[PDB]
Design an enzyme around this catalytic site. Structure first.
Site, PDB file in Angstrom:
ATOM      1  N   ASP A 128      -8.268   5.835   5.064  1.00  5.44           N
ATOM      2  CA  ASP A 128      -7.612   4.855   4.195  1.00  5.44           C
ATOM      3  C   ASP A 128      -6.629   5.534   3.237  1.00  5.44           C
ATOM      4  OD1 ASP A 128      -9.260   2.831   5.277  1.00  5.44           O
ATOM      5  OD2 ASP A 128      -9.788   2.033   3.288  1.00  5.44           O
ATOM      6  N   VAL A 129      -5.614   4.790   2.800  1.00  4.14           N
ATOM      7  CA  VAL A 129      -4.600   5.332   1.877  1.00  4.14           C
ATOM      8  C   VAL A 129      -4.922   5.079   0.386  1.00  4.14           C
ATOM      9  CG1 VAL A 129      -3.092   3.265   1.854  1.00  4.14           C
ATOM     10  CG2 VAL A 129      -2.081   5.620   1.593  1.00  4.14           C
TER      11      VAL A 129
ATOM     12  N   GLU B  97     -14.303  -1.707  11.111  1.00  5.77           N
ATOM     13  CA  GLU B  97     -15.522  -1.003  10.723  1.00  5.77           C
ATOM     14  C   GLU B  97     -16.726  -1.402  11.570  1.00  5.77           C
ATOM     15  OE1 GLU B  97     -17.689  -1.457   6.721  1.00  5.77           O
ATOM     16  OE2 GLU B  97     -16.468   0.402   6.589  1.00  5.77           O
TER      17      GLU B  97
ATOM     18  N   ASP C  81     -17.020   5.825  -4.295  1.00  2.00           N
ATOM     19  CA  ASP C  81     -16.328   5.001  -5.278  1.00  2.00           C
ATOM     20  C   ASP C  81     -17.065   5.164  -6.619  1.00  2.00           C
ATOM     21  OD1 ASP C  81     -15.417   2.994  -6.995  1.00  2.00           O
ATOM     22  OD2 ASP C  81     -15.075   1.548  -5.380  1.00  2.00           O
TER      23      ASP C  81
ATOM     24  N   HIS D 266     -21.236   5.440   4.643  1.00  2.00           N
ATOM     25  CA  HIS D 266     -20.711   4.470   3.669  1.00  2.00           C
ATOM     26  C   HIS D 266     -21.464   4.619   2.328  1.00  2.00           C
ATOM     27  CE1 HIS D 266     -19.748   0.679   1.782  1.00  2.00           C
ATOM     28  NE2 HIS D 266     -19.101   0.210   2.836  1.00  2.00           N
TER      29      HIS D 266
ATOM     30  N   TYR E 252       0.806  -1.249   0.000  1.00  2.00           N
ATOM     31  CA  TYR E 252       0.000   0.000   0.000  1.00  2.00           C
ATOM     32  C   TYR E 252       0.832   1.290   0.000  1.00  2.00           C
ATOM     33  CZ  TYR E 252      -4.502  -2.491   0.303  1.00  2.00           C
ATOM     34  OH  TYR E 252      -5.585  -3.309   0.032  1.00  2.00           O
TER      35      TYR E 252
HETATM   36  O1  LIG Z   1      -1.797  -4.657   2.959  1.00  5.05           O
HETATM   37  C1  LIG Z   1      -2.395  -3.696   3.452  1.00  5.05           C
HETATM   38  C2  LIG Z   1      -3.770  -3.762   3.727  1.00  5.05           C
HETATM   39  C3  LIG Z   1      -4.423  -2.661   4.295  1.00  5.05           C
HETATM   40  N1  LIG Z   1      -3.697  -1.475   4.588  1.00  5.05           N
HETATM   41  C4  LIG Z   1      -4.328  -0.273   5.184  1.00  5.05           C
HETATM   42  O2  LIG Z   1      -5.659  -0.567   5.675  1.00  5.05           O
HETATM   43  C5  LIG Z   1      -6.572   0.261   4.904  1.00  5.05           C
HETATM   44  C6  LIG Z   1      -7.871  -0.487   4.688  1.00  5.05           C
HETATM   45  O3  LIG Z   1      -7.668  -1.626   3.834  1.00  5.05           O
HETATM   46  P1  LIG Z   1      -8.275  -1.637   2.306  1.00  5.05           P
HETATM   47  O4  LIG Z   1      -8.215  -0.247   1.775  1.00  5.05           O
HETATM   48  O5  LIG Z   1      -7.621  -2.715   1.529  1.00  5.05           O
HETATM   49  O6  LIG Z   1      -9.789  -2.058   2.635  1.00  5.05           O
HETATM   50  P2  LIG Z   1     -11.054  -1.667   1.679  1.00  5.05           P
HETATM   51  O7  LIG Z   1     -11.248  -0.195   1.481  1.00  5.05           O
HETATM   52  O8  LIG Z   1     -10.791  -2.414   0.302  1.00  5.05           O
HETATM   53  O9  LIG Z   1     -12.275  -2.351   2.429  1.00  5.05           O
HETATM   54  C7  LIG Z   1      -5.822   0.568   3.594  1.00  5.05           C
HETATM   55  O10 LIG Z   1      -6.361   1.771   3.034  1.00  5.05           O
HETATM   56  C8  LIG Z   1      -4.429   0.839   4.121  1.00  5.05           C
HETATM   57  O11 LIG Z   1      -4.416   2.117   4.779  1.00  5.05           O
HETATM   58  C9  LIG Z   1      -2.313  -1.402   4.302  1.00  5.05           C
HETATM   59  O12 LIG Z   1      -1.679  -0.370   4.547  1.00  5.05           O
HETATM   60  N2  LIG Z   1      -1.673  -2.513   3.731  1.00  5.05           N
HETATM   61 MN   LIG Z   2      -9.727   1.290   1.369  1.00  6.41          MN
END
Ligand SMILES: O=c1ccn([C@@H]2O[C@H](COP(=O)(O)OP(=O)(O)O)[C@@H](O)[C@H]2O)c(=O)[nH]1
Ligand SMILES: [Mn+2]
Ligand SMILES: CCCCCCCCO[C@@H]1O[C@H](CO)[C@H](O)[C@H](O)[C@H]1O[C@@H]1O[C@@H](C)[C@@H](O)[C@@H](O)[C@@H]1O
Length: 286
Positions: free
Chosen positions: A146-147, A238, A261, A168, A65
């Site tokens: 989230d990143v 969550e 999204d 959401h 990430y």
């Molecule tokens: O391998 C990983 C998995 C998750 N994350 C962090 O946990 C957040 C939430 O996970 P993800 O965005 O995959 O979940 P989603 O939005 O798909 O439910 C990511 O934005 C990252 O900030 C990370 O840094 N590395």
């Molecule tokens: Mn995410």
């Protein structure tokens, strides 16, 4: 103490004209729901600048990430709290993979090295955030996101308040029985089918440092109880966030403009702006 606002010229609010008639703009506990058209950003900018407000933004970039950081930070520079003091806290297992991103004046970035979990990565953010004494000294509010995201439009001081959650984008039209809350009574995150205000997104919450620490401490404690009880909540952090915000009502709720999204959900009529959006990814690959 808070000094007087300066003289300002702007359109008079109209008591017998709502800003928005298509959406709910206040919760039943009298917290604003933040939508485009509900706020005059010039007034809010004045109020927060007069307090010399500093906003902390936390983001985790673990393992693959780190790839998301460049777009995340460069767009945050264009759209997040511009004109205000900002401190980014980037939690990563790879400090050398953090991109060199040019920051505007009054904005800083700190790289915080952490370990990498092999669901656990997402879940441990609450623990990692709850750090405690440092945030209290350096920032006034904390925003936790989230990143795998980019800013496309204004995200500013309109969000700031003691405690906020974000609707959401998949569930803002859903009835509560359809919400994907933890439904097993054996979990600390459990919420029955007859309870629930909204379904909040784990990817964007925040508040004052004090309230964010309370929230993250409570969610970390609840997750620990669950682990000791051999149970993991259906949507992990969550699910716990949703339980917390059910029992501790947020003082603002952000509309899905703030966590969208476009690939998945398009651009419906109710959204005047798409502010902070998912970056397409291959979930299991990444
Ligand atoms: O391998 C990983 C998995 C998750 N994350 C962090 O946990 C957040 C939430 O996970 P993800 O965005 O995959 O979940 P989603 O939005 O798909 O439910 C990511 O934005 C990252 O900030 C990370 O840094 N590395
Ligand atoms: Mn995410
Ligand atoms: C194809 C997948 C379709 C997923 C739509 C529902 O959404 C998911 O809802 C879950 C709770 O019920 C979690 O909040 C999850 O993080 C979210 O998926 C995330 O946020 C979404 C908005 C998307 O960006 C998705 O790609 C993410 O994994």
């Amino acid at each position: 103490f808070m000094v007087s606002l300066p003289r300002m010229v702007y359109p008079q609010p109209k008591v017998l004209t709502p800003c928005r008639k298509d959406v709910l703009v206040v919760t039943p506990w009298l917290a604003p729901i933040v939508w485009e058209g509900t706020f005059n950003i010039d007034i809010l900018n004045e109020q927060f600048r007069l307090q010399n407000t500093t906003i902390g933004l936390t983001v985790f970039a673990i393992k693959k990430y780190v790839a998301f950081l460049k777009l995340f930070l460069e767009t945050a520079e264009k759209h997040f709290m511009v004109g205000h003091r900002v401190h980014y806290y980037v939690f990563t297992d790879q400090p050398a993979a953090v991109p060199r991103v040019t920051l505007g004046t009054g904005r800083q970035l700190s790289v915080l090295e952490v370990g990498a979990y092999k669901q656990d990565v997402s879940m441990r953010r609450m623990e990692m955030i709850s750090c405690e004494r440092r945030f209290l000294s350096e920032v006034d509010y904390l925003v936790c996101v989230d990143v795998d995201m980019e800013f496309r439009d204004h995200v500013g001081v309109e969000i700031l308040t003691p405690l906020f959650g974000t609707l959401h984008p998949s569930f803002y039209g859903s009835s509560r029985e359809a919400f994907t809350y933890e439904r097993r009574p054996q979990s600390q995150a459990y919420i029955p089918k007859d309870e629930g205000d909204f379904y909040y997104m784990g990817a964007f919450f925040g508040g004052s440092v004090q309230e964010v620490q309370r929230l993250t401490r409570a969610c970390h404690q609840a997750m620990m109880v669950d682990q000791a009880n051999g149970i993991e909540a259906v949507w992990h952090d969550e699910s716990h966030l949703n339980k917390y915000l059910l029992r501790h009502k947020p003082t603002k709720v952000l509309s899905p403009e703030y966590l969208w999204d476009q690939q998945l959900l398009g651009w419906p009529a109710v959204l005047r702006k798409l502010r902070f959006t998912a970056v397409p990814k291959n979930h299991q690959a990444v």
